[PDB]
């Protein structure tokens, strides 16, 4: 949902503001890449020709097989307002946005760009030693704070304010601590690309009054910049944002020239294993990983017991699982992490198990379960234990003069979906606290 999340945000932008967003070719080049392959084909056709083409001509290009894709492509292209539908002379003519059309032409033809891509000072620096370590550590520092593991340096208030204000990393002053949420665990599960977009996407929504267009001109322009290069100094709002981006480990500053980082290019497109582990029937964990990230995430729902240089060994316990569940982590997410981070040895034996299962009876195709079924059931069973006691808040209605009134009030609650329990024999029912006021008002009327 990488492009979908970014595309969804662009749709809510007003058309008047969308036009301003297309002025800079740098943004246009990225917005052109995010569209589906078929959509990109048509855009490249219309950009260089100064004419209007009927939609029927576009349909002729697509084969009958790809008709469904032509509907998603046109719908997505029309949603962004990049494709302007003009109807005249009884024909629904189709044209591209002039600003987007002009912006794309300038970049591709090498025309004036208004420094959308920046400038070069030729003061290259070493990236692996400093840039990789700095951003990796800076991106790791926020993760250690997110995971809750102790670490001396804490992230700046700018990002910290964003985290609390965002659904990520729910906090309470009375508790005085920060804990991960259901979406927080999902955030940790997402790849680095999406893991960076989520925080940025939250940042886009957090910012208020720094112009909305200026923020996009900077973030998209950041991907265009190439790591290990210098760029002179930029908008006034971008200056404070540039410092703000420095807190996210995206841009490195020596203290006139700013240097992008590996994460900057990773934002545009994508790009034994570390983190792979073995799960036994004894609820033991043996991770063939040497990295704080894999160790830190495993400790969320695993009671670590010992570690080696190359691997880390631990044992799953009810207490550790209960601690993880208390934080809002669903068992489905836990198994997904284990399944998607399974050791090749488990996969090979699991494939053999599927082959053996199909070899004996090839009629049925049982699911490929890497880890023994008992672990999944017990983990799910532990989840059921937490959900054993179910309690609601509300009011109980009784002492009804007539059955008709009891049925009327009870039926009304059911219609509005606030009824939790009823009994015709006792003429009593219970409604949620949320619907209490609505039921009372109906009772009076």
């Amino acid at each position: 949902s990488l492009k979908h999340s970014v595309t969804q945000y662009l749709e809510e932008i007003p058309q008047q503001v969308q036009n301003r967003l297309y002025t800079s070719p740098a943004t246009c080049l990225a917005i052109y890449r995010i569209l589906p392959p078929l959509a990109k084909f048509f855009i490249m056709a219309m950009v260089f020709n100064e004419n209007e083409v009927p939609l029927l001509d576009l349909d002729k290009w697509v084969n009958s097989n790809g008709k469904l894709q032509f509907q998603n492509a046109i719908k997505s292209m029309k949603s962004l307002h990049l494709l302007i539908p003009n109807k005249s002379s009884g024909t629904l003519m189709i044209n591209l946005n002039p600003t987007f059309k002009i912006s794309l032409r300038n970049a591709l033809t090498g025309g004036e760009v208004q420094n959308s891509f920046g400038v070069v000072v030729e003061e290259n620096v070493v990236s692996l030693d400093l840039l990789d370590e700095y951003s990796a550590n800076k991106w790791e520092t926020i993760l250690h704070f997110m995971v809750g593991t102790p670490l001396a340096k804490i992230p700046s208030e700018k990002v910290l304010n964003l985290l609390k204000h965002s659904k990520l990393m729910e906090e309470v002053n009375s508790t005085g601590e920060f804990k991960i949420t259901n979406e927080g665990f999902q955030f940790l599960l997402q790849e680095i690309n999406s893991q960076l977009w989520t925080l940025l996407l939250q940042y886009l929504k957090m910012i208020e009054t720094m112009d909305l267009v200026d923020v996009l001109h900077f973030i998209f322009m950041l991907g265009a910049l190439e790591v290990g290069k210098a760029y002179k100094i930029l908008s006034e709002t971008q200056r404070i944002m540039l410092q703000d981006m420095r807190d996210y480990g995206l841009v490195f500053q020596k203290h006139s020239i700013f240097y992008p980082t590996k994460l900057a290019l990773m934002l545009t497109s994508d790009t034994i294993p570390d983190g792979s582990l073995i799960v036994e029937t004894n609820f033991k964990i043996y991770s063939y990983s040497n990295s704080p990230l894999q160790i830190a995430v495993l400790s969320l729902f695993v009671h670590l017991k010992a570690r080696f240089v190359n691997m880390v060994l631990g044992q799953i316990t009810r207490e550790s699982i209960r601690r993880a569940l208390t934080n809002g982590i669903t068992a489905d997410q836990i198994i997904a992490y284990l399944e998607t981070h399974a050791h090749p040895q488990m996969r090979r034996l699991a494939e053999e198990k599927l082959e053996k299962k199909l070899e004996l009876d090839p009629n049925c195709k049982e699911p490929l379960q890497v880890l023994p079924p008992t672990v999944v059931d017990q983990i799910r069973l532990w989840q059921l234990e937490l959900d054993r006691v179910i309690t609601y808040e509300g009011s109980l209605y009784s002492d009804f003069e007539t059955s008709q009134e009891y049925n009327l009030l009870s039926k009304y609650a059911q219609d509005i979906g606030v009824l939790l329990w009823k009994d015709d024999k006792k003429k009593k029912f219970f409604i949620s606290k949320e619907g209490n006021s609505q039921v009372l008002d109906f009772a009076k009327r």
């Binding site: 509300g394 109980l396 002492d399 003069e401």
Partner: protein, 65 residues
């Protein structure tokens, strides 16, 4: 026409009996019996029964050391 604020508890016979035993020891726990799968409980005691009941159930489950 009469409303009574409270907490509606939905559970199984086994949990229902455990709540009754806690209600027997502490009268205020259960306010009224609704059905074999629903009980009315005092809101204040919810935060205490939930943690204490788990300790009672811990006897039925063997945790090795």
């Amino acid at each position: 026409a009469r409303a009574r604020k409270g907490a509606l508890v939905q559970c199984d016979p086994s949990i229902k009996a455990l709540i009754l035993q806690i209600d027997a020891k502490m009268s205020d726990i259960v306010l009224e019996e609704l059905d074999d799968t629903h009980l009315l409980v005092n809101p204040s005691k919810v935060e205490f029964v939930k943690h204490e009941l788990n300790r009672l159930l811990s006897k039925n489950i063997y945790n090795p050391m």
